[PDB]
Amino acid sequence: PVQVLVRFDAGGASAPEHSQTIAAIRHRIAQAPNVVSVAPPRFADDNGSALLSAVLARDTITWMRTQLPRVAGAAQVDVG
């Protein structure tokens, strides 16, 4: 299960204003190689970040680290 963490600089991750960014990142993850399921976003109790977990891994992580930043924009993304 590949992990992707999304951090926002203003407001909580679950804020409605951020949901489309999370939805866009989630949709791009599902397009990654050998990916078949993407979990809905899991929000830290701090609401500082959102965890997206994709069930399927080298080629995937490098693919995500290359493709997801375009989609995330100003938000910070990190692949485990």
Residue 51: count other Cβ atoms within 10 Å of its Cβ. 15
Q: Give this entry's resolution in angstroms.
A: 2.4
What type of residue sits at position 17? E
Computed from CA positions of residues 12, 16, 18, 20, in that sequence, does the dihedral angle turn out positive or negative?
positive
Q: Method used for this model?
A: X-ray
Buried (b) or exposed (e) across 18-41, using 16+ Cβ within 10 A?
beebbebbbebbeebeebeebeeb
Q: Is 60 exposed, middle or buried (0-12, 13-18, 19+ CB in 10 A)?
A: middle
Domain ranges for the chain: 1-80
